[PDB]
Amino acid sequence: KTAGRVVRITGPVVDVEFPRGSVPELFNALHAEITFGALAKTLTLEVAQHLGDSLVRCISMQPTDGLVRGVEVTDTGASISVPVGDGVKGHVFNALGDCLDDPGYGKDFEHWSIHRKPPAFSDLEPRTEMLETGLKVVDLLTPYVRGGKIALFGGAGVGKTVLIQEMINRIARNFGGTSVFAGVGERTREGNDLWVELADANVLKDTALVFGQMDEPPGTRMRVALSALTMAEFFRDEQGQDVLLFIDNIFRFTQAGSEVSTLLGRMPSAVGYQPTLADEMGELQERITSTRGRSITSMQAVYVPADDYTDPAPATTFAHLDATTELSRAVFSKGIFPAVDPLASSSTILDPAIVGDEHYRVAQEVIRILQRYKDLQDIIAILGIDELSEEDKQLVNRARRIERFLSQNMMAAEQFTGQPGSTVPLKETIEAFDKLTKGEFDHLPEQAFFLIGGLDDLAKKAESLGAKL
Amino acid sequence: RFGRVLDAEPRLSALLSDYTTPAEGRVALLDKALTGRPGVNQTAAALLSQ
Amino acid sequence: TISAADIEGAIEDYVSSFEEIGTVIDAGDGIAHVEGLPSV
Numbered sequence: 001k002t003a004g005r006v007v008r009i010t011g012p013v014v015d016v017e018f019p020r021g022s023v024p025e026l027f028n029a030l031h032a033e034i035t036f037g038a039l040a041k042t043l044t045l046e047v048a049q050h051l052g053d054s055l056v057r058c059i060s061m062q063p064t065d066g067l068v069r070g071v072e073v074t075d076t077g078a079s080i081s082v083p084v085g086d087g088v089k090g091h092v093f094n095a096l097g098d099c100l101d102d103p104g105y106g107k108d109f110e111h112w113s114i115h116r117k118p119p120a121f122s123d124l125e126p127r128t129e130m131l132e133t134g135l136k137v138v139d140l141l142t143p144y145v146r147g148g149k150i151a152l153f154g155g156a157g158v159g160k161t162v163l164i165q166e167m168i169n170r171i172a173r174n175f176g177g178t179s180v181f182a183g184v185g186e187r188t189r190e191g192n193d194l195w196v197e198l199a200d201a202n203v204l205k206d207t208a209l210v211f212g213q214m215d216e217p218p219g220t221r222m223r224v225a226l227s228a229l230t231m232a233e234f235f236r237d238e239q240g241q242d243v244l245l246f247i248d249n250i251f252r253f254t255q256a257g258s259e260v261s262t263l264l265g266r267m268p269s270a271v272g273y274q275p276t277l278a279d280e281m282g283e284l285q286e287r288i289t290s291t292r293g294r295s296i297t298s299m300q301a302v303y304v305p306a307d308d309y310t311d312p313a314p315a316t317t318f319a320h321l322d323a324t325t326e327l328s329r330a331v332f333s334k335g336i337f338p339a340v341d342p343l344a345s346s347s348t349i350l351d352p353a354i355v356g357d358e359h360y361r362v363a364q365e366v367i368r369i370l371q372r373y374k375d376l377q378d379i380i381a382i383l384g385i386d387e388l389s390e391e392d393k394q395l396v397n398r399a400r401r402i403e404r405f406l407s408q409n410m411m412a413a414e415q416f417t418g419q420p421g422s423t424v425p426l427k428e429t430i431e432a433f434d435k436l437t438k439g440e441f442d443h444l445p446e447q448a449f450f451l452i453g454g455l456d457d458l459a460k461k462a463e464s465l466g467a468k469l
Numbered sequence: 470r471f472g473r474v475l476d477a478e479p480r481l482s483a484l485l486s487d488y489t490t491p492a493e494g495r496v497a498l499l500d501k502a503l504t505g506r507p508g509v510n511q512t513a514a515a516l517l518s519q
Numbered sequence: 520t521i522s523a524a525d526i527e528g529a530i531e532d533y534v535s536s537f538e539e540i541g542t543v544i545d546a547g548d549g550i551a552h553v554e555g556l557p558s559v
């Protein structure tokens with residue numbers, strides 16, 4: 001016939017020999033069969049390289065345990081495809097398009113290949129419409145962009161997932177469009193929690209969930225993002241419906257790529273990463289984008305290994321974003337939630353042209369005060385605050401109050417603390433931080449500013465402490 | 470012509486293209502399949518077999 | 520001049536004419552390499 005046979009197996013990577021003239025194209029899906037009892041299954045191999053001599057190196061989506069050399073391998077003749085349409089909403093899928101909450105569902109749907117080129121450059125248009133979230137720190141210092149790309153960077157356990165949940169609550173809840181969530185190499189129980197929460201909040205009927213989680217082979221963990229992005233692309237390009245795309249975690253896509261590259265025999269780059277790290281990341285990211293008249297607001301949680309922000313993965317990820325919230329271990333240690341580093345975070349739309357002159361002025365004054373406090377940390381760690389000048393002492397008190405007031409009781413934090421969250425209008429945020437920067441609340445105790453919403457909450461908490469606003 | 474027919478049947482060549490098996494066996498396979506036919510030239514047969 | 524079916528009549532006969540024991544070919548530092556065991 002024309003089927004190949006397995007010749008080499010090195011974990012997830014498989015070498016397959018085909019008859020001449022039947023070598024499958026790159027990224028084609030191939031099917032092999034594992035027949036051993038407990039592990040019996042059908043393997044989907046994605047062609048990754050042509051090795052010559054009619055050999056192809058392929059990445060397996062399922063574990064290859066139990067696979068035998070010489071077993072027949074059949075070429076599907078196309079790449080991995082996933083179901084698309086309004087039918088995907090409300091259902092949970094895996095990287096290959098199989099429905100998990102209801103097996104067999106979506107087999108009759110239109111199927112789109114998970115590999116496609118990004119939009120033509122001529123169709124790209126910069127997006128600068130502010131997306132108001134109701135979080136003080138985000139709205140003030142890192143205003144999110146509607147139809148733009150937002151990222152949440154952070155080491156282990158600084159609050160990336162909780163912030164993703166917060167943004168799902170604040171944005172996807174009262175959203176007229178569709179939402180796509182892509183769990184990429186994260187906790188499976190987190191996927192179950194998200195499923196149940198979306199069902200409870202009635203947002204699930206408008207959301208499509210695709211999960212390739214930690215206990216998956218690197219091939220699945222590097223293709224699940226493509227699958228979810230394909231569903232989002234269908235919603236963007238075929239139904240003209242505003243799309244929300246939450247991804248957690250994209251660094252796991254990079255990590256799976258690194259593992260595959262190691263298995264594929266590629267010569268490692270710096271820090272052991274794949275040589276094609278930036279290229280793979282760009283190929284993925286340029287697909288996540290709004291086009292003229294077609295909006296995708298994407299929000300990606302990016303894991304920072306060992307709290308190292310100079311690691312190649314996040315370092316290359318930084319360039320693909322319109323807004324970048326950076327969660328810091330130190331801020332988290334102080335108890336400030338969300339543990340945003342206001343000096344390392346940024347937004348392309350935080351300029352006087354877009355957000356107005358007063359918003360920009362207040363943000364810049366807050367940043368200046370916090371930068372001066374950061375500079376003075378060296379003195380303060382040794383001698384405390386009392387060796388500073390009167391100007392610097394006043395600035396330090398103001399800065400401590402400001403950094404506490406950037407924290408907020410989040411909606412998604414209720415499950416942890418039992419305290420309901422708060423929403424602060426942008427105008428109130430600007431007014432409040434203008435008052436802070438001018439020293440109108442210097443008399444209030446610091447804890448009065450901790451985990452509250454607007455100025456009314458500030459007054460109530462200050463009164464409960466003992467100071468009157 | 471032998472080149473053309475081998476090209477048409479890549480799998481036959483692949484089976485014949487292994488030295489992991491005794492030479493006499495593959496020579497016999499070649500004789501039965503292609504070379505051992507009424508019109509095959511004797512010299513071409515011997516050349517291909519060797 | 521070529522039947523294209525006698526080809527099968529001969530190749531199936533050849534293939535049909537064909538426990539598993541492997542042999543350590545090299546060993547070092549907790550790793551071993553085995554030749555044979557085609558069905559492993």
Ligand SMILES: Nc1ncnc2c1ncn2[C@@H]1O[C@H](COP(=O)(O)OP(=O)(O)OP(=O)(O)O)[C@@H](O)[C@H]1O
Pocket residue numbers: 154155156157158159160161162163303337338410412413416417
């Ligand atoms: N806003 C918050 N209020 C209170 N506690 C919080 C808040 N955000 C995070 N936490 C605490 O931090 C823990 C870690 O949060 P989260 O799972 O969102 O972090 P992460 O950065 O996604 O972590 P990981 O690297 O493990 O995926 C939460 O379980 C909770 O204990």
Ligand SMILES: [Mg+2]
Pocket residue numbers: 160161162186
């Ligand atoms: Mg997380």
